[PDB]
């Protein structure tokens, strides 16, 4: 786990996942049905779905009918009224363990390949806004139909006012992307965000264009928490088969490394994290 990188970067936080077990002061399981009224999976902290094998985090998706721990808890009717899901999988979140604000975030991962799988590396902004105004940085999203295509994608409202999703995203095709591990990299100042695979640029954003109207002030100059997950289905994503053909399937994260220059820790201290204003 290098401490340096040329550019006077320096390791600040991460996980090579070499432990006896997932480190609870670094990751927490998401539990139950969380998102996407078209999804087919419920999320569990059970090693079945979540564990360290061969020095990766393993998020492992099983065709398996399983009760939704949110079956009558949470304020979304379709979650609140869905007793069971076919399909269990894993999701870890730093929501409660680590927030990131400026730096370079390196995530190395091999992705599953079967009908309906939706592996994702992504971050949500913690600030006075709710989705999508808070912000969302999708380093990776992949879907079954188009399995060699990497989507990286920013989500945010057009001004501070409208809560419509004025998203900006790019794509690269990597041929047989499921064969090898690829490094997903986000560089982030208070002036831009770069989202790469494998040193190929998927999407840049200039943050001098994501200012929100009046005061409000920029969702991308607040801290963001990290999510590693495999969903199943989606309103757009091939749905996984009624009978679970192709499953089980694994999403392997070799490592998560966060780095910061003197510069990136400097810029952080100089913005109201609740708003992104100077
Ligand atoms: Ca590792």
Author numbering: 10 to 287
Original paper wording:
Here we describe the discovery and characterisation of endo-acting glycoside hydrolases expressed by mucin-degrading members of the HGM that are able to cleave the O-glycan chains of a range of different animal and human mucins. These O-glycanases display endo-β1,4-galactosidase activity and specifically target the polyLacNAc structures that comprise the main backbone of many mucin glycan chains. All of the GH16 enzymes comprise a β-jellyroll fold, characteristic of the family, consisting of two β-sheets composed of β-strands that form the core fold, which were superimposable with other GH16 structures previously published. Overall these data reveal that the nine GH16 enzymes analysed are endo acting β1,4-galactosidases that display a preference for polyLacNAc structures found in mucins and other similar glycans such as KS.
The apo structures of BACCAC_02680, BACCAC_02680E143Q, BACCAC_03717 and Amuc_0724 were obtained to 2.0, 2.1, 2.1 and 2.7 Å, respectively. Two of the A. muciniphila enzymes (Amuc_0724 and Amuc_0875) cluster in a different branch and are relatively close to GH16 family members that have been characterised as having endo β-1,3-galactanase activity. However, Amuc_0724 displayed significant endo-like activity against laminarin and weak activity against barley β-glucan and lichenan. In contrast, BACCAC_03717 and Amuc_0724 both possess a finger 2 (in addition to 1, 3, 5 and 6) and this has a more variable topology than the other fingers. The structure of Amuc_0724 in this area is much more open and is a likely explanation for this enzymes additional activity against laminarin. Furthermore, the open space at the O4 in Amuc_0724 is a potential pocket for sulfation that the Bacteroides spp. enzymes would not be able to accommodate. For the GH16 family as a whole, there is no conserved way of selecting between glucose and galactose and specificity for galactans arises in distinct branches of β-glucanases of the phylogenetic tree (the endo-β1, 3-galactanases are another example of this), providing an example of convergent evolution. The structures for BACCAC_03717 and Amuc_0724 are more accommodating of milk oligosaccharides and have more open +1 subsites. The human mucin samples were incubated with Amuc_0724, due to its broad activity, in combination with the sialidase BT0455GH33 and the products were labelled with procainamide, and analysed using LC-FLD-ESI-MS.
